[PDB]
Amino acid sequence: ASLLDSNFVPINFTEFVQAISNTYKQRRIQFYENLKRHKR
Amino acid sequence: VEERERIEKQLLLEAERINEIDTLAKAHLSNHFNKEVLLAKGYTLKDIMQAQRRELVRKFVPIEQIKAIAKVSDISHIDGEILEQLVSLAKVNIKLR
Amino acid sequence: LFDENYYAKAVANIIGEVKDPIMYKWFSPDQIEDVDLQMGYQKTVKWDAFLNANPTTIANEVNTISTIGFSSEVVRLNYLKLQYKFRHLKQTSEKFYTSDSYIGDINNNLLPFAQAYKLASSEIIKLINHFVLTGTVSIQKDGKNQKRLLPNMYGLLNMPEQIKEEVASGDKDKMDKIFEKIEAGLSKLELGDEFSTPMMVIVDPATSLKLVKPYAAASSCEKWEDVLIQTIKAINNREDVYIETSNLLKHKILIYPLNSELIKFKPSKYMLPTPNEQVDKDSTDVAHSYIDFVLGGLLATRKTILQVNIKQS
Amino acid sequence: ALMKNPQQDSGLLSNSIDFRDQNLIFSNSGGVCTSSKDKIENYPAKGYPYKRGVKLSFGDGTTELEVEAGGGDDLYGVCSDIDEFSGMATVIPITNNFTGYLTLKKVNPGDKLNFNQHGELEKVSVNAIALSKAHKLTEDLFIVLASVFGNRA
């Protein structure tokens, strides 16, 4: 239920809004996964 | 073992048919009917192939030929040799297109 | 929906081009947890105990004993929903403004919906970042004419009941004086049980340039940054110390732990910009759209953030 | 010189990093707060009345009426935008309120402002209230955020 999935097809605006929020969450998850803070 | 050899021959034949159908369908219909997303949605391989064939008919073959040659407007249940004739007509239509 | 609505399709194809907010670097992955609320509030309850007087000696017979009191505290986090409007070009009119290398009326400062939305989203994200760091909403570089916000809405820099240090104007360029105030603030910090946690420092670029100088007759293999990390490592049980620089800050140093127990960010799941379904339409080619975003969700324990201000004359 | 879009080209790319104090430019057309239920009218432009009070001016009769920069008892509306190719000025009627940046005669928030003969705002009929101090864009160009509420003595 995210915009990152190509197979996702929004039936209505409300589902589209939910996909936006899910996509935002997955991106921030991915950012922290890839984040590597510089030590010292 | 030649029985299994001929079985593998038929396997290659239908695999080539599937590959050709998929390659033309990707460039003609949409990316929504890609094999990966259809499998994710939970359709068997043969179901995916027949659905793609029916969509190909619904894109190239005009509806009048469906309700006359195939005797029904809905391609939802016509599958078989009539579906083979329909996809052949769709191939002719895309050739002339 | 996508077939019936062009704008929904446009935003979906363009949302991936918007850069991630910079606030994420200031918080650990665990410190952020989303909530399902557009506008309203959330409440939590904490229980404390305290001593009323000296203990009572149990000798012979006595009926009057000293008491241990209790206190209840209710903490409320407020949320607010805000909206912006921007003009753009109708989809059907884009072809009549397409040019060799651009699309849009340069003379009248108009754009296609997709480009307009992306630029709008980026500016709002900048405003959200400014609020989370500084706790205020303003468009003037001076900082006046602030939008009046609801109470219980605070950022890292404006959080009350925190340790605040001020460096005198005459010692603005003296790194020793600046480091002296930081150490005084570090002593007054009260981590208590939650001490074995990573710490985070955010500084302005002018401060960062002063840090990279060698420690002071000058020393060897020892910079002011290295000394500061050691001092912070003393009080955080030799944990990781991270230093970041933000252009938003000005002569300010912000030090706080990265533990969810002490400071936690609970933003709304609709905090980041989101398109609105309402689109203004008319007979001309000029159309309007709306974007919604939610502010608020920062929570912190008292006396756990160090704020150093270097007064500039 | 005075046009909304400067004719002189820019030597360098702009730095799009800051987001504060980037709206106090003369190219900023329209209003700061705009409602979807606002009445707006285009009219032929006599001169360059952009961001000025306008009044109705009549010719001999061969050509239709036009709008020219002006105020006083003859004030009819506020020009919030202009299209130079067609010479059409978008005018908001005085019967409709407006909030945006307007030309100020060459002032603190709360001051009462009325339009002069040249369609420029000046300190005191009262027509609008200044929402900020004067912002100088050129040696003679002064803009100011104002909210107009029609006519009242």
Coordinates of C-alpha atoms in Angstrom, one line a residue:
Chain A
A1 CA 0.0 0.0 0.0
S2 CA 2.7 2.4 -1.0
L3 CA 3.6 4.5 -4.1
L4 CA 7.0 2.7 -4.3
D5 CA 5.1 -0.4 -5.5
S6 CA 4.4 -0.2 -9.2
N7 CA 1.5 -2.7 -8.9
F8 CA -0.3 -0.4 -6.6
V9 CA -3.6 1.0 -8.1
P10 CA -5.4 3.6 -6.0
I11 CA -9.2 3.2 -6.1
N12 CA -9.9 6.6 -4.6
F13 CA -8.2 9.7 -3.2
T14 CA -8.2 8.4 0.3
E15 CA -6.2 5.3 -0.6
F16 CA -3.9 7.6 -2.5
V17 CA -3.3 9.7 0.6
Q18 CA -2.6 6.5 2.6
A19 CA -0.1 5.4 0.0
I20 CA 1.7 8.7 0.3
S21 CA 2.0 8.4 4.1
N22 CA 3.2 4.8 3.7
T23 CA 5.7 5.9 1.1
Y24 CA 7.0 8.6 3.4
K25 CA 7.5 6.1 6.2
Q26 CA 9.3 3.6 4.0
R27 CA 11.7 6.4 2.7
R28 CA 12.6 7.5 6.2
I29 CA 13.1 3.8 7.2
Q30 CA 15.4 3.4 4.1
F31 CA 17.2 6.6 5.0
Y32 CA 18.1 5.4 8.5
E33 CA 19.1 2.0 7.1
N34 CA 21.5 3.7 4.7
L35 CA 22.6 6.4 7.1
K36 CA 26.2 6.0 8.5
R37 CA 27.1 8.8 10.9
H38 CA 30.7 9.9 10.8
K39 CA 32.5 9.0 14.1
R40 CA 35.1 11.4 15.6
Chain B
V1 CA 13.5 -41.5 -22.4
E2 CA 12.5 -40.1 -25.8
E3 CA 9.0 -39.6 -24.3
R4 CA 10.5 -37.1 -21.8
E5 CA 12.5 -35.7 -24.7
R6 CA 9.3 -34.9 -26.7
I7 CA 7.7 -33.6 -23.5
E8 CA 10.6 -31.2 -23.2
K9 CA 10.1 -30.3 -26.9
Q10 CA 6.5 -29.3 -26.1
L11 CA 7.6 -27.5 -23.0
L12 CA 10.0 -25.4 -25.1
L13 CA 7.3 -24.8 -27.6
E14 CA 4.8 -23.4 -25.0
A15 CA 7.6 -21.5 -23.3
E16 CA 8.5 -19.8 -26.6
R17 CA 4.8 -19.0 -27.1
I18 CA 4.5 -17.6 -23.6
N19 CA 7.6 -15.5 -24.1
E20 CA 6.3 -14.1 -27.4
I21 CA 2.9 -13.3 -25.9
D22 CA 4.5 -11.5 -23.0
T23 CA 7.0 -9.5 -25.1
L24 CA 4.2 -8.2 -27.4
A25 CA 1.8 -7.6 -24.5
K26 CA 4.3 -5.5 -22.5
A27 CA 4.7 -3.1 -25.4
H28 CA 1.0 -3.1 -26.3
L29 CA -1.3 -3.2 -23.3
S30 CA 0.2 -1.9 -20.0
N31 CA 2.8 -2.5 -17.3
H32 CA 0.0 -3.3 -14.8
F33 CA -0.3 -6.8 -16.4
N34 CA 3.4 -7.7 -16.0
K35 CA 4.1 -11.2 -15.0
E36 CA 5.7 -10.2 -11.7
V37 CA 2.8 -8.0 -10.5
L38 CA 0.2 -10.6 -11.6
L39 CA 2.1 -13.4 -9.8
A40 CA 2.2 -11.1 -6.7
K41 CA -1.6 -10.6 -7.0
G42 CA -1.8 -14.4 -7.0
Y43 CA -2.5 -15.8 -10.4
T44 CA -1.1 -19.0 -11.8
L45 CA 1.1 -18.9 -14.9
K46 CA -1.6 -20.3 -17.2
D47 CA -4.2 -18.0 -15.7
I48 CA -1.8 -15.0 -16.4
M49 CA -1.2 -16.2 -20.0
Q50 CA -4.9 -16.6 -20.7
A51 CA -5.8 -13.2 -19.1
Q52 CA -3.1 -11.6 -21.2
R53 CA -4.5 -13.3 -24.3
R54 CA -8.1 -12.1 -23.5
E55 CA -6.8 -8.6 -23.1
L56 CA -5.0 -8.8 -26.4
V57 CA -8.2 -9.8 -28.0
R58 CA -10.0 -6.9 -26.2
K59 CA -7.4 -4.5 -27.6
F60 CA -7.0 -5.6 -31.3
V61 CA -10.0 -7.8 -32.2
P62 CA -13.2 -5.7 -32.6
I63 CA -16.2 -6.6 -30.6
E64 CA -18.4 -7.6 -33.6
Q65 CA -16.0 -10.5 -34.4
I66 CA -16.1 -11.5 -30.8
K67 CA -19.9 -11.7 -30.8
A68 CA -20.1 -13.4 -34.2
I69 CA -17.1 -15.7 -34.6
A70 CA -16.8 -16.4 -30.8
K71 CA -20.6 -16.2 -30.5
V72 CA -20.3 -14.2 -27.2
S73 CA -19.5 -10.6 -26.4
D74 CA -17.7 -11.6 -23.2
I75 CA -14.3 -13.2 -23.7
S76 CA -14.5 -14.1 -20.0
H77 CA -15.6 -17.7 -20.8
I78 CA -14.7 -18.5 -24.4
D79 CA -11.3 -20.1 -23.7
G80 CA -10.1 -22.8 -26.1
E81 CA -9.7 -23.1 -29.8
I82 CA -12.0 -20.1 -30.2
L83 CA -9.5 -18.2 -28.1
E84 CA -6.8 -19.4 -30.4
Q85 CA -8.8 -18.1 -33.4
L86 CA -9.3 -14.8 -31.6
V87 CA -5.6 -14.4 -30.8
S88 CA -4.7 -15.2 -34.4
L89 CA -7.1 -12.5 -35.5
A90 CA -5.5 -10.2 -33.0
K91 CA -2.1 -11.0 -34.5
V92 CA -3.4 -10.2 -38.0
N93 CA -4.8 -6.9 -36.6
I94 CA -1.5 -5.9 -35.0
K95 CA 0.3 -6.9 -38.2
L96 CA -2.0 -4.6 -40.3
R97 CA -1.8 -1.9 -37.6
Chain C
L1 CA -8.4 7.2 -9.9
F2 CA -5.3 7.8 -11.9
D3 CA -7.2 7.5 -15.2
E4 CA -10.0 9.8 -13.9
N5 CA -7.6 12.3 -12.2
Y6 CA -4.5 13.5 -13.9
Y7 CA -3.2 15.5 -11.0
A8 CA -3.1 12.4 -8.7
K9 CA -1.1 10.6 -11.4
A10 CA 1.2 13.6 -11.7
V11 CA 2.1 13.8 -8.0
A12 CA 2.5 10.0 -7.7
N13 CA 5.1 10.0 -10.5
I14 CA 6.9 13.1 -9.0
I15 CA 6.8 12.4 -5.3
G16 CA 10.0 10.3 -5.5
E17 CA 12.0 13.3 -6.7
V18 CA 11.4 15.2 -3.4
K19 CA 14.5 15.1 -1.1
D20 CA 14.2 13.7 2.4
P21 CA 14.0 16.2 5.3
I22 CA 17.2 17.1 7.1
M23 CA 15.6 16.7 10.5
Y24 CA 16.1 12.9 10.3
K25 CA 19.8 13.3 11.0
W26 CA 19.0 15.0 14.4
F27 CA 17.1 12.0 15.8
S28 CA 17.9 8.3 16.2
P29 CA 15.7 5.8 14.3
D30 CA 13.9 4.8 17.5
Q31 CA 13.3 8.4 18.7
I32 CA 10.6 9.0 16.0
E33 CA 7.2 7.3 16.1
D34 CA 4.3 8.4 14.0
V35 CA 0.8 9.0 15.4
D36 CA -2.6 8.9 13.7
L37 CA -4.0 12.4 14.3
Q38 CA -4.5 15.5 12.1
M39 CA -5.6 18.1 14.6
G40 CA -6.1 17.6 18.4
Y41 CA -4.0 16.6 21.3
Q42 CA -2.5 13.6 23.1
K43 CA -2.0 13.2 26.9
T44 CA 0.2 11.2 29.1
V45 CA 0.5 10.8 32.9
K46 CA 3.7 10.6 35.0
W47 CA 3.9 9.8 38.7
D48 CA 6.5 11.3 41.1
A49 CA 7.4 10.9 44.8
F50 CA 9.2 13.2 47.2
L51 CA 10.2 13.5 50.8
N52 CA 8.4 15.9 53.1
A53 CA 10.8 16.0 56.1
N54 CA 13.6 14.2 57.8
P55 CA 13.0 10.5 58.8
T56 CA 11.4 9.9 62.2
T57 CA 13.4 8.1 64.9
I58 CA 11.7 5.0 66.2
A59 CA 12.4 5.4 69.9
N60 CA 9.9 4.5 72.7
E61 CA 6.4 5.4 71.8
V62 CA 5.5 7.9 69.0
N63 CA 2.5 8.6 66.8
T64 CA 3.6 11.5 64.6
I65 CA 5.7 10.2 61.6
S66 CA 7.1 12.0 58.6
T67 CA 5.3 11.6 55.3
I68 CA 6.3 10.8 51.7
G69 CA 4.3 12.8 49.2
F70 CA 3.2 12.0 45.7
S71 CA 2.4 14.1 42.7
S72 CA 0.6 13.6 39.4
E73 CA 1.6 15.3 36.1
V74 CA -0.3 15.3 32.9
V75 CA 1.6 16.1 29.7
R76 CA -0.3 17.2 26.6
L77 CA 1.1 17.4 23.0
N78 CA -0.7 19.7 20.6
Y79 CA -1.0 19.2 16.8
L80 CA -2.0 21.8 14.2
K81 CA -3.1 21.4 10.5
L82 CA -1.9 24.1 8.1
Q83 CA -2.5 24.6 4.4
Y84 CA -1.0 26.5 1.4
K85 CA -2.3 27.4 -2.0
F86 CA -0.4 27.7 -5.3
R87 CA -1.3 28.6 -8.8
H88 CA -0.4 26.5 -11.9
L89 CA -1.4 25.7 -15.4
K90 CA -4.3 23.5 -16.4
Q91 CA -3.3 20.2 -17.9
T92 CA -5.1 20.8 -21.2
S93 CA -3.4 24.1 -21.7
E94 CA 0.2 22.8 -21.3
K95 CA 0.7 22.1 -25.0
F96 CA 0.0 25.8 -25.8
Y97 CA 2.8 26.9 -23.5
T98 CA 5.3 24.2 -24.4
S99 CA 8.5 25.6 -25.8
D100 CA 11.9 24.4 -27.2
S101 CA 13.5 23.8 -23.8
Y102 CA 10.9 24.7 -21.2
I103 CA 7.2 24.7 -20.4
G104 CA 5.5 27.7 -18.8
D105 CA 4.8 31.4 -19.3
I106 CA 8.0 33.1 -18.2
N107 CA 6.3 36.5 -18.7
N108 CA 3.5 35.7 -16.3
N109 CA 5.5 33.3 -14.0
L110 CA 3.4 30.2 -14.5
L111 CA 4.4 26.5 -14.5
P112 CA 2.9 23.1 -15.2
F113 CA 1.2 21.5 -12.2
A114 CA 4.0 18.9 -11.7
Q115 CA 6.9 21.4 -11.5
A116 CA 4.8 23.8 -9.4
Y117 CA 4.0 21.1 -6.9
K118 CA 7.6 19.9 -6.5
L119 CA 8.9 23.4 -5.9
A120 CA 6.0 24.1 -3.5
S121 CA 6.7 20.9 -1.5
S122 CA 10.4 21.7 -1.2
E123 CA 9.7 25.1 0.4
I124 CA 7.2 23.7 2.9
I125 CA 9.6 21.0 3.9
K126 CA 12.2 23.8 4.6
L127 CA 9.6 25.5 6.8
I128 CA 8.9 22.2 8.7
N129 CA 12.6 21.7 9.3
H130 CA 13.0 25.3 10.6
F131 CA 10.1 24.7 13.1
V132 CA 11.4 21.4 14.5
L133 CA 14.8 22.9 15.2
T134 CA 13.8 26.3 16.4
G135 CA 10.2 25.8 17.5
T136 CA 8.9 28.9 15.6
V137 CA 7.1 29.5 12.4
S138 CA 8.1 32.7 10.5
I139 CA 9.0 33.8 7.0
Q140 CA 11.0 36.9 7.8
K141 CA 14.7 36.4 8.2
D142 CA 14.5 38.7 11.3
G143 CA 12.1 36.2 12.9
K144 CA 9.3 38.6 13.7
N145 CA 5.6 38.4 12.7
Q146 CA 5.5 34.8 14.0
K147 CA 2.4 32.8 13.5
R148 CA 0.6 32.5 16.9
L149 CA 0.7 28.8 17.8
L150 CA -1.1 26.7 20.3
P151 CA 0.6 26.0 23.7
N152 CA 2.4 22.8 24.3
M153 CA 4.0 23.2 20.9
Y154 CA 7.8 23.5 21.3
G155 CA 11.0 22.8 19.4
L156 CA 14.5 21.8 20.4
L157 CA 15.8 25.4 20.7
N158 CA 12.8 26.9 22.5
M159 CA 12.1 24.1 25.0
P160 CA 11.5 25.5 28.5
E161 CA 13.1 24.3 31.7
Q162 CA 16.4 23.5 30.0
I163 CA 20.0 24.4 30.7
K164 CA 20.9 27.7 29.0
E165 CA 24.3 29.3 28.8
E166 CA 25.3 32.7 27.5
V167 CA 28.8 33.7 26.2
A168 CA 29.7 37.3 26.7
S169 CA 30.1 39.5 23.6
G170 CA 33.7 40.4 24.4
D171 CA 34.6 36.7 24.4
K172 CA 32.8 35.9 21.1
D173 CA 36.0 34.7 19.4
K174 CA 37.7 33.2 22.4
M175 CA 37.3 29.5 22.1
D176 CA 38.4 28.9 25.7
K177 CA 35.6 31.0 27.0
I178 CA 33.1 29.3 24.7
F179 CA 34.3 25.9 25.8
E180 CA 34.2 27.0 29.5
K181 CA 30.4 27.7 29.2
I182 CA 29.9 24.4 27.5
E183 CA 31.5 22.5 30.3
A184 CA 29.5 24.5 32.9
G185 CA 26.3 23.5 31.0
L186 CA 27.5 19.9 30.7
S187 CA 27.9 19.7 34.5
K188 CA 24.3 21.0 35.0
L189 CA 23.0 18.4 32.7
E190 CA 20.9 15.7 34.5
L191 CA 20.8 12.5 32.6
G192 CA 20.4 10.3 35.6
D193 CA 19.7 6.7 34.7
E194 CA 19.7 7.3 31.0
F195 CA 23.4 8.2 30.6
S196 CA 24.8 5.3 28.6
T197 CA 23.3 6.8 25.4
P198 CA 24.7 8.5 22.3
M199 CA 24.8 12.3 22.4
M200 CA 24.2 14.8 19.5
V201 CA 25.7 18.3 19.0
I202 CA 24.4 20.8 16.4
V203 CA 26.4 23.9 15.7
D204 CA 26.4 26.9 13.4
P205 CA 29.1 27.0 10.6
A206 CA 31.0 29.8 12.3
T207 CA 31.2 27.7 15.4
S208 CA 32.3 24.6 13.5
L209 CA 35.2 26.5 11.9
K210 CA 36.4 27.5 15.4
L211 CA 36.2 23.8 16.5
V212 CA 38.6 22.4 13.9
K213 CA 41.4 24.6 15.2
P214 CA 44.1 22.8 17.2
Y215 CA 43.5 22.8 21.0
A216 CA 45.3 25.5 23.0
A217 CA 51.1 27.2 23.1
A218 CA 49.1 25.1 20.7
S219 CA 48.8 21.4 21.2
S220 CA 49.5 18.5 18.9
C221 CA 47.0 15.9 17.5
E222 CA 44.4 17.6 19.6
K223 CA 41.7 19.9 18.2
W224 CA 39.0 21.7 20.1
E225 CA 36.5 19.3 18.5
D226 CA 38.5 16.3 19.9
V227 CA 38.5 17.8 23.4
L228 CA 34.8 18.5 23.3
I229 CA 34.1 14.9 22.3
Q230 CA 36.1 13.6 25.2
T231 CA 34.2 15.9 27.6
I232 CA 30.9 14.7 26.4
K233 CA 32.2 11.1 26.4
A234 CA 32.8 11.6 30.1
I235 CA 29.2 12.1 31.0
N236 CA 27.6 9.7 28.5
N237 CA 29.5 6.6 29.6
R238 CA 32.0 6.8 26.7
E239 CA 29.2 6.5 24.1
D240 CA 29.1 7.8 20.5
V241 CA 29.2 11.6 20.1
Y242 CA 27.9 13.0 16.8
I243 CA 28.4 16.6 15.6
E244 CA 26.3 18.2 12.9
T245 CA 26.2 21.7 11.4
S246 CA 23.0 23.5 10.4
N247 CA 22.9 26.8 8.6
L248 CA 19.5 27.5 10.3
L249 CA 21.3 28.1 13.7
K250 CA 23.1 31.3 14.3
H251 CA 25.7 31.5 17.1
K252 CA 23.9 28.6 18.9
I253 CA 25.1 25.3 20.2
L254 CA 22.6 22.5 20.9
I255 CA 23.5 19.4 22.9
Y256 CA 21.0 16.7 23.8
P257 CA 20.9 12.9 24.1
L258 CA 19.6 10.5 21.4
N259 CA 17.6 8.3 23.8
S260 CA 13.9 7.8 23.2
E261 CA 13.3 7.7 27.0
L262 CA 14.4 11.3 27.5
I263 CA 13.4 13.0 24.2
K264 CA 10.9 11.5 21.8
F265 CA 9.4 12.9 18.6
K266 CA 5.9 11.8 17.9
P267 CA 4.9 13.5 14.6
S268 CA 1.6 13.0 12.8
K269 CA 1.5 10.5 9.9
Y270 CA 0.3 13.5 7.8
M271 CA 3.0 15.9 8.9
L272 CA 4.8 15.9 5.6
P273 CA 3.2 17.8 2.7
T274 CA 0.2 16.1 1.1
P275 CA -2.0 17.2 -1.8
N276 CA -5.6 18.2 -1.4
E277 CA -8.4 16.9 -3.5
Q278 CA -9.9 20.4 -4.2
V279 CA -8.7 22.0 -7.4
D280 CA -10.0 25.4 -8.4
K281 CA -11.0 25.5 -12.1
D282 CA -12.2 28.3 -14.3
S283 CA -12.6 29.1 -18.0
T284 CA -9.0 30.4 -18.2
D285 CA -5.8 28.3 -18.0
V286 CA -5.0 29.3 -14.4
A287 CA -5.7 26.7 -11.8
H288 CA -5.1 26.4 -8.0
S289 CA -4.2 23.6 -5.7
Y290 CA -3.8 23.1 -2.0
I291 CA -1.2 21.3 0.2
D292 CA -1.7 20.2 3.8
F293 CA 0.9 19.6 6.5
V294 CA 0.8 19.0 10.2
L295 CA 3.1 20.5 12.9
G296 CA 3.9 19.4 16.4
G297 CA 4.9 16.2 18.1
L298 CA 8.1 16.9 20.0
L299 CA 8.4 15.7 23.6
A300 CA 11.4 16.0 26.0
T301 CA 12.3 15.6 29.6
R302 CA 13.2 18.7 31.5
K303 CA 16.8 19.6 32.1
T304 CA 18.1 17.4 29.3
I305 CA 19.0 19.9 26.6
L306 CA 21.9 22.3 26.6
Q307 CA 21.5 25.5 24.7
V308 CA 24.5 27.8 24.4
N309 CA 24.1 31.3 22.8
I310 CA 27.2 33.3 21.8
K311 CA 26.0 36.9 22.1
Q312 CA 27.3 38.9 19.2
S313 CA 27.9 42.5 20.5
Chain D
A1 CA 12.5 50.4 -15.3
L2 CA 9.1 49.9 -13.6
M3 CA 7.8 46.8 -15.4
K4 CA 6.9 43.7 -13.3
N5 CA 9.5 41.5 -15.1
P6 CA 12.9 43.2 -15.4
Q7 CA 14.1 43.4 -19.0
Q8 CA 17.8 43.2 -18.0
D9 CA 18.9 39.6 -17.9
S10 CA 20.6 38.0 -14.9
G11 CA 24.3 37.2 -15.0
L12 CA 24.3 34.3 -12.6
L13 CA 22.1 31.5 -11.3
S14 CA 20.2 32.3 -8.1
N15 CA 21.0 30.4 -4.9
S16 CA 17.9 28.5 -3.9
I17 CA 18.9 27.5 -0.4
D18 CA 17.2 30.0 1.9
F19 CA 13.5 30.3 2.2
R20 CA 13.1 33.6 4.2
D21 CA 12.4 37.1 2.9
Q22 CA 12.2 35.8 -0.7
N23 CA 8.7 37.3 -1.5
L24 CA 9.5 41.0 -1.2
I25 CA 10.1 41.4 -5.0
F26 CA 8.2 43.6 -7.4
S27 CA 7.5 40.6 -9.6
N28 CA 5.2 39.1 -6.9
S29 CA 1.8 39.3 -8.6
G30 CA -1.5 38.8 -7.0
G31 CA -2.3 38.8 -3.3
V32 CA -0.7 37.2 -0.2
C33 CA -4.0 35.6 0.8
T34 CA -6.5 34.9 -2.0
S35 CA -9.9 33.4 -1.7
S36 CA -11.5 31.3 -4.4
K37 CA -14.6 33.5 -4.3
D38 CA -12.9 36.8 -5.4
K39 CA -14.2 38.9 -8.3
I40 CA -11.4 39.9 -10.7
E41 CA -11.8 41.9 -14.0
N42 CA -9.4 42.7 -16.8
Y43 CA -9.4 46.1 -18.5
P44 CA -7.4 47.9 -21.2
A45 CA -4.4 49.6 -19.5
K46 CA -3.6 53.3 -20.0
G47 CA 0.1 53.6 -19.0
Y48 CA 1.5 51.2 -16.4
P49 CA -0.9 51.0 -13.4
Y50 CA 0.6 47.8 -12.0
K51 CA 0.3 47.5 -8.2
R52 CA -1.5 50.9 -8.1
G53 CA -5.0 52.2 -7.5
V54 CA -6.9 52.6 -10.8
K55 CA -9.7 54.8 -11.9
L56 CA -12.1 54.6 -14.9
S57 CA -11.1 56.9 -17.8
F58 CA -13.2 57.6 -20.9
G59 CA -12.1 58.6 -24.3
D60 CA -14.1 60.5 -27.0
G61 CA -16.3 57.4 -27.6
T62 CA -14.7 55.7 -30.5
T63 CA -12.8 53.3 -28.2
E64 CA -14.1 51.6 -25.1
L65 CA -13.3 52.7 -21.5
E66 CA -9.9 52.0 -20.0
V67 CA -8.3 52.1 -16.5
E68 CA -5.5 54.5 -15.5
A69 CA -3.5 54.9 -12.3
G70 CA -5.4 57.2 -9.9
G71 CA -7.2 57.5 -6.6
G72 CA -9.2 59.9 -4.6
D73 CA -12.9 60.1 -5.2
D74 CA -12.4 58.6 -8.6
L75 CA -10.9 55.3 -7.3
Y76 CA -12.5 52.2 -8.8
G77 CA -10.2 49.3 -7.9
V78 CA -6.8 47.9 -7.4
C79 CA -4.6 46.6 -10.2
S80 CA -3.0 43.3 -8.9
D81 CA -1.6 42.0 -12.2
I82 CA -0.9 43.0 -15.8
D83 CA -0.2 41.2 -19.1
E84 CA 2.2 43.2 -21.2
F85 CA 1.5 41.4 -24.5
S86 CA -2.2 42.2 -24.5
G87 CA -2.0 45.4 -22.4
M88 CA -4.7 44.1 -20.1
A89 CA -4.7 45.0 -16.4
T90 CA -6.4 42.7 -13.9
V91 CA -8.4 44.9 -11.6
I92 CA -10.1 43.9 -8.3
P93 CA -13.2 46.0 -7.6
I94 CA -13.2 48.4 -4.6
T95 CA -16.3 46.4 -3.5
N96 CA -14.0 43.4 -2.9
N97 CA -11.3 43.5 -0.2
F98 CA -7.7 42.7 -1.0
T99 CA -4.5 42.0 0.9
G100 CA -1.2 42.3 -0.9
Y101 CA 1.9 44.5 -1.6
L102 CA 1.1 47.9 -3.1
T103 CA 3.1 50.9 -4.2
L104 CA 3.7 53.4 -1.4
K105 CA 4.4 57.1 -1.9
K106 CA 8.0 58.0 -1.2
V107 CA 4.8 54.3 8.1
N108 CA 4.2 51.6 10.7
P109 CA 1.7 48.8 10.9
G110 CA -1.7 50.1 11.9
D111 CA -1.4 53.4 10.0
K112 CA -4.3 54.5 7.9
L113 CA -3.6 54.8 4.1
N114 CA -5.5 56.5 1.3
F115 CA -4.7 56.6 -2.5
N116 CA -3.3 59.7 -4.1
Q117 CA -3.8 61.1 -7.6
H118 CA -1.1 58.8 -8.9
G119 CA -2.5 55.6 -7.5
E120 CA 0.1 55.5 -4.7
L121 CA -0.6 54.8 -1.0
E122 CA 0.1 57.5 1.5
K123 CA -0.5 58.3 5.2
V124 CA -3.8 60.0 6.0
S125 CA -11.4 59.2 3.7
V126 CA -9.6 55.9 4.8
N127 CA -9.3 53.0 2.4
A128 CA -6.7 50.6 3.7
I129 CA -4.5 49.8 6.8
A130 CA -0.7 49.2 6.5
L131 CA 0.3 45.8 7.8
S132 CA 4.1 46.4 7.7
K133 CA 6.7 49.1 7.2
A134 CA 7.8 50.4 3.8
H135 CA 10.1 48.1 1.9
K136 CA 12.5 49.8 -0.5
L137 CA 13.2 48.1 -3.8
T138 CA 14.7 51.1 -5.7
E139 CA 15.6 54.7 -5.0
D140 CA 11.9 55.6 -5.7
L141 CA 10.1 52.2 -5.5
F142 CA 8.5 51.6 -2.1
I143 CA 6.1 48.7 -1.6
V144 CA 4.0 47.9 1.5
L145 CA 1.7 45.1 2.6
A146 CA -1.8 46.6 3.0
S147 CA -5.3 45.3 3.3
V148 CA -8.1 47.4 1.6
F149 CA -11.6 47.4 3.0
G150 CA -13.5 49.7 0.6
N151 CA -14.5 53.2 1.4
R152 CA -15.2 54.7 4.8
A153 CA -14.9 58.3 6.2

